[PDB]
């Protein structure tokens, strides 16, 4: 089989009678743009591992995905953001819950999988040991977007 | 939640999902997402999986593991698996939402039960596909 | 024909390091625990409220690493985890990284049977349990000298 | 880390499992015990579980799940589920410790591949029978 990705931001919270074209051809892009990326790195050679783990920051990084940067907010108003990532070559995995002070939940997944004995953290604790390893601490406003907080207070 | 999947030139199959929950979550709730096997699973026997839906129906039928199991113990093909997870057995159980997959042969999956899930795919030095609804 | 099993962990057993004092309060602990477990299945008891019994017995002996008897952390702390499933309905409940509830086996079946939720952690799963009556504790409760001095060798 | 399986007499199959964790622990570690598939299952149609062990590997291994899908899928029996995933399996990962398990039939079992493993198991009406070493 030759080398292929797929990628996803998310099923459920879409309508087409709640869309207009111009957010349509926004997700698009960017979807577009992503995976695209990822076909590149497949090609050149690079890992799988490598290659999911970028398109998920990627993803986070973008802030039309809730994941990352334009994060949901819970009912509190905070951010609470987890990622899982698992290699099929060594059934190695990593994965962090419930973290607020890292920008990407992805690579400290990926941080707890390679630099770390364990497979699990969770809270304070993953980002301790995040912080740790050089990991930057970041201040949970940066995941913070309009648009998510309207969608709380619609939600209320 | 945003997930991917990836089969390489070497054979490796791996996979990554992340997300911030949900809106109006209530704090301390972990849904499927960081869970192996529930949001997701890679195995270079099997099949790579990363899912997106209900949360807790994904943790309780541990729908990514579930894929690579049925096909690795039950004969399925990728599409049959997909199908009896997302088409069948999450709806079953009150879930929705969907998931995307690759296994070790190159075929790939991106089922979903909802009206939309953001996606694409393609393989290396093609065209990709996106898609929304459908 | 019901029937039940229980368990009080496997790895930490050396019949070279131990005494036949030790072996038999641990004998003991696990018979009670199994035959009150009988007793209920055959009064027609649930399965589910059976192993909820069960694994609060367990947690409140200070024999077993769970509940009373916990180990301490890297920090000298206690960090306790559990989950619960039900094979009739599916549904389950988990909780970790909780340090102020006496019985997470009960905080994990409170999770189950009083949220729409599977899995909570840290303090966000203790405020739930503490907003629906659930005691708070403080996990100075849980400490032993025996797992304070395999902390100190630990640290050897 | 401690836990229990039960069978009713309505035929409903229940798991608990519940832990501290490990002496000198890293803050924020999670090990199998609180996660569904890992170190709990329960299924009506097939199997009750509840694991102790190196917490990542039953984790990487999803060692509650694995019993049931290799029984429900695989056709395999409680004993040889339990053979293949405590004696083959996890070992090859580097997994040490054991579970117990009760099947929808009332087959009970104890597998470990530690040296000991404190356990208990009894019908009821029975007598127990408990158990330190192999
Ligand atoms: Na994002
Ligand atoms: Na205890």
């Known amino acids: 089989g030759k080398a292929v990705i797929a990628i996803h931001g998310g099923a459920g919270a879409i309508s087409r009678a709640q869309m207009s074209l111009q957010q349509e051809?926004?997700?698009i892009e960017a979807l577009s743009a992503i995976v695209e990326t990822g076909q590149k790195m497949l090609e050149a050679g690079e890992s799988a591992?490598?290659?999911?783990?970028?398109?998920v920051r990627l993803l986070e990084e973008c802030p039309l995905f809730n994941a990352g940067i334009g994060a949901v907010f819970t009912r509190d108003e905070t951010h609470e953001l987890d990622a899982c990532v698992m290699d099929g070559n060594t059934l190695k995995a990593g994965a962090v819950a419930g973290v607020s002070h890292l920008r990407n939940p992805v690579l400290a997944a990926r941080l707890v999988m390679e630099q770390s004995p364990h497979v699990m953290m969770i809270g304070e604790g993953a980002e301790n040991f995040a912080f740790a390893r050089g990991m930057e601490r970041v201040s949970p406003e940066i995941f913070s977007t309009s648009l998510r907080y309207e969608q709380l207070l619609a939600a209320r | 939640t945003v997930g991917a999947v990836a089969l390489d030139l070497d054979g490796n199959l791996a996979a990554a999902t992340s997300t911030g929950g949900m809106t109006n979550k209530l704090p301390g709730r972990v849904?499927?997402?960081?869970?192996?096997?529930?949001?997701?699973?890679?195995?270079?026997?099997s099949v790579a999986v990363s899912c997106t839906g209900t949360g807790e129906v994904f943790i309780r039928a541990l729908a990514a593991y579930d894929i690579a199991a049925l096909m690795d113990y039950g004969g399925l093909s990728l599409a049959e698996a997909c199908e009896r997870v997302v088409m069948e057995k999450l709806?079953?159980?009150?879930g929705s939402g969907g998931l995307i997959a690759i296994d070790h042969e190159g075929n790939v999956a991106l089922p979903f039960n909802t009206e939309g899930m953001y996606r694409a795919w393609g393989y290396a030095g093609d065209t990709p596909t996106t898609g929304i609804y459908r």
């Open chain 1, 25 to 27: 051809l926004r997700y």
């Open chain 1, 49 to 55: 591992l490598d290659v999911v783990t970028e398109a």
């Open chain 2, 31 to 45: 849904g499927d997402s960081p869970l192996v096997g529930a949001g997701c699973y890679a195995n270079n026997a």
């Open chain 2, 91 to 94: 709806p079953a159980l009150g």
